[PDB]
Each structure stands twice: as structure tokens, then as C-alpha cells.
Design a protein around this ligand. Structure first.
Ligand SMILES: OC[C@H]1O[C@@H](O[C@@H]2[C@@H](O)[C@H](O)O[C@H](CO)[C@H]2O)[C@H](O)[C@@H](O)[C@@H]1O
Ligand SMILES: [Ca+2]
Length: 410
């Protein structure tokens, strides 16, 4: 094994080297390149990765700095986050319409929310601020045209009505909106965010994407079938994102119903995604060559989000931290690949390095996921998410409401 993680100092060193290796995939700070994105999209044969994964990377590095204190990449991350905000400061840059799902926009909004929670350095005074960016994403997702009567509510996967998948009302789009609402409520203490989060969670429960018996979290359903054709694929990031948002709602409301939802979602996640202590992407990881670029990132979010759950729902700490530890141990045990002797693959439970070429990418998602898992081993030393009591960001009451905003020509 190359990376050591037995003490705080070893974890810090390993995380620093993992942050270096993940950054090698990113070209956006170089002359002539586009800040904020990994190479791609694959539809243009420019690389393996879609725009939203750039947003996920940005968030991973906001967390990296928060967890380790290393600010080395902060300027690169600030540039990338600011470059992708779009003309209306809402993470809807029109050049990216083709991949503009509510989840894609949502992941960028969640990285901005994380920047506010982590007190990431503020953009310059003339630029959009982190809280305001999160508020803009949430506001556009709350806009009435995104909430029609099909399936009695819920967000559709896609924002543009002509995008493939507009007829699919899926968990992840709704989970992003839920998580943002819960986090905006806790940060700002504004209850309208929380009321929307309650409504969306109740919808996810009612439509049955959350299994009422097992608390498994399914993928979605289509409007032409009243959302009853549930796709029962269980992706780790769906359950984990609902757990994360539910923990924010528990912390904000102190309502036992939210504690119960945290506990039930957590029981399900441990049952379904952790195999002898190691996170496992059950829809695809059981055979090599099936996981897509998107799926290779999910276990990193699971680690980072579950770690934060232990801070804001501290009664979960003893259920979560030991399991994240064994999962991160498996992650580093297989980061031994050539040519460096430390290249990371995806198949942590297997105990062996598998070249990322088996899943047809250069390996950035695997690198991101290991960075996330190792960094998050430092959660016990980190500050919890800030609120407006101690945060340094600034909001905008008209976030998402510009007169040229895309909702005005929907
Ligand atoms: O899975 C990542 C992203 O996939 C997007 O759909 C792709 C389109 O952007 C592209 O134009 O065509 C391919 C199929 O040829 C689609 O897979 C979604 O729009 C994104 O939300 C999604 O995150
Ligand atoms: Ca490829």
C-alpha cells in the first residue's frame, strides 16, 4: 500500500497527494482552456466527463480545504466555480443547455452552498457570492413551471422541455432541490426553504421512490405512467443525498419525524451500499465495465456527505465513522496502480487495483472518490457547517429572479 492513513498527519499527507493526482486531470486553469470543467463532454469527443462533474470536483476541493486546511487549490477552484455561473448567476450557462438537468444545476448549487457553509473565501465584490448562487439555483428550481401536476408534483430530470429525459421525474433532481432547501433553511433560518424541502421529501415518499418498508431509494419514474413505472436501480448518491438533507432538516427543526427519517435512511444505506464495511455501487460495480463516468463519482459523495451527517446529526456518529474508516481503508489499499504506484481504481471492495480504462475513462472520478473518502477521515477535527451566525458569504433576495432569466422565456 502506498498511502498511509493511520494518524491525522498521515491522512493529511495522503490527502495532499491525492489532491495533486486528481488535479492532474483538470486543465481548466491553463491558457486556452475552460475553467470549471473536466475534459469533455464525451458527446463532442473532448473527454470523458460532463459539465456537472466539474461542479462535483469543485465541491470536492472546497471540502478538501475545509478538512485539511490546505488552501493550495483555492484560487483554481474559485475561478472554476465563478466561470460556470452563467449570465444570470444561476448555474444555467446556455452553452450547456444539452446537459442542463435539475441535478446538473443542483450539483453546482450544492458546491456553492458548501462554499458558504465552509467559509470558503468570498469571490470579489462585483461577482456573485456563494450563498447567492445557491439561492439562485434553489429559486429557479422552485419556479412554478418546474412543478406541474403530473405525478401530483416533483421536478422533472431535465430543465429544457425538448431535452431527452424531460418525461422522467427522478430522485436525484428532487434530492438536489430537497438538499439545497434544507441547507438554505439551516444557513439563513428562513422557513420558506424548509417548507419546500418538506414538500419535496413528502412527494418522494408518496410517489414511492423511497420504499416505505425498507427505505431503499429508487431512481425515478416517467410521467406517462404517472411515475408508477419505478426504476428500482439503487444508486448510492440518491439515498446518501436524502440522508444528508434529512440531517439538515433534523438539525434545523428538531422534529422527531426528521430524526426518524435520518435513522431509517441510514439503516438502509448501511444495509444496501456497505459490504463488510466498504461502499459498493450496487447497480454496476459487481462486474467490471458497467459503471459510467457519472457512477464512478458517487461513492466519493457518499463519504463526504455521510461525514457531514455526523456533525449535524451527532447521534449518528458511531454508526457512520467506523464504516467510513473501513471503506476508506479499502479505497487506499487499491491505490497502487501503475505507472505511479499510487493510481486509484474504483473496485475498493475487491481489494485489487483495476485500471480505470475498464470503465472507459481516464480515471478522474475514481481519483475524486478516493480524495473525498480520505479527506473526510478528518471530519472529527473540522468545523461543522456554518450558518449566517458565523458565515462570511452574502445572499441576494432576487437570486434567480433576473428579468433575462431563462424562466421568463420558458
Ligand atoms: O449523465 C450525464 C449527463 O447526461 C446528459 O444527457 C446527455 C446529453 O447531454 C447529450 O447531449 O446526449 C447524451 C446521449 O447521447 C446524454 O447522455 C443529461 O442531460 C445530463 O443531466 C446528465 O447529467
Ligand atoms: Ca472514454
Amino acid at each position: 500500500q502506498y498511502y498511509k492513513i493511520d494518524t491525522k498527519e498521515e491522512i493529511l499527507e495522503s490527502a495532499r497527494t491525492l489532491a495533486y493526482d486528481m488535479m492532474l486531470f483538470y486543465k481548466g486553469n491553463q491558457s486556452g482552456e475552460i475553467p470549471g470543467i473536466l475534459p469533455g463532454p464525451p458527446t463532442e469527443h473532448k473527454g470523458d466527463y460532463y459539465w456537472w462533474e466539474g461542479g462535483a470536483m469543485m465541491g470536492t476541493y472546497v471540502d478538501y480545504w475545509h478538512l485539511t486546511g490546505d488552501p493550495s487549490y483555492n484560487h483554481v477552484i474559485m475561478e472554476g466555480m465563478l466561470h460556470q455561473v452563467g449570465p444570470n448567476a444561476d448555474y444555467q450557462p446556455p452553452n450547456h443547455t444539452a446537459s442542463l438537468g435539475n441535478d446538473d444545476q443542483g450539483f453546482w448549487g450544492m458546491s456553492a452552498m458548501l462554499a458558504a457553509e465552509n467559509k470558503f473565501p468570498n469571490p470579489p465584490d462585483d461577482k456573485p457570492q456563494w450563498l447567492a448562487l445557491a439561492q439562485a439555483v434553489w429559486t429557479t428550481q422552485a419556479s412554478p413551471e418546474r412543478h406541474d401536476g403530473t405525478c401530483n408534483g416533483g421536478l422533472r430530470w431535465q430543465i429544457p422541455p425538448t431535452n431527452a429525459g424531460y418525461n422522467y421525474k427522478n430522485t436525484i433532481a428532487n434530492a438536489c432541490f430537497f438538499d439545497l432547501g434544507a441547507r438554505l433553511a439551516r444557513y439563513t433560518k428562513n422557513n420558506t426553504y424548509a417548507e419546500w424541502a418538506e414538500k419535496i421529501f413528502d412527494w418522494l415518499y408518496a410517489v414511492g421512490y423511497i420504499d416505505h418498508e425498507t427505505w431503499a431509494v429508487y431512481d425515478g419514474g416517467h410521467v406517462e405512467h404517472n411515475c408508477t413505472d419505478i426504476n428500482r436501480a439503487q444508486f448510492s448518491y440518491n439515498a446518501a443525498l436524502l440522508l444528508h438533507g434529512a440531517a439538515f432538516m433534523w438539525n434545523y427543526t428538531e422534529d422527531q419525524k426528521w430524526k426518524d427519517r435520518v435513522d431509517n435512511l441510514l439503516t438502509g444505506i448501511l444495509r444496501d451500499f456497505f459490504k463488510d464495511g466498504v461502499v459498493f455501487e450496487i447497480p454496476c460495480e459487481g462486474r467490471q465495465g458497467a459503471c459510467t463516468a457519472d457512477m464512478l463519482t458517487f461513492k466519493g459523495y457518499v463519504h463526504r456527505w455521510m461525514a457531514v451527517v455526523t456533525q449535524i446529526a451527532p447521534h449518528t456518529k458511531d454508526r457512520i465513522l467506523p464504516v467510513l474508516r473501513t471503506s476508506a481503508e479499502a479505497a487506499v489499499k487499491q491505490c497502487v496502480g501503475p505507472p505511479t504506484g499510487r493510481r486509484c481504481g474504483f473496485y475498493w471492495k475487491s481489494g485489487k487495483f483495476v485500471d480505470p480504462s475498464v470503465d472507459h475513462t481516464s480515471g478522474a472520478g475514481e481519483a475524486m472518490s478516493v480524495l473525498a473518502a480520505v479527506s473526510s477521515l478528518l471530519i472529527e477535527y473540522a468545523e461543522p457547517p456554518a450558518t449566517n451566525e458565523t458565515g462570511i458569504s452574502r445572499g441576494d433576495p432576487n437570486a434567480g429572479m433576473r428579468s433575462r432569466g431563462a424562466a421568463q422565456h420558458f
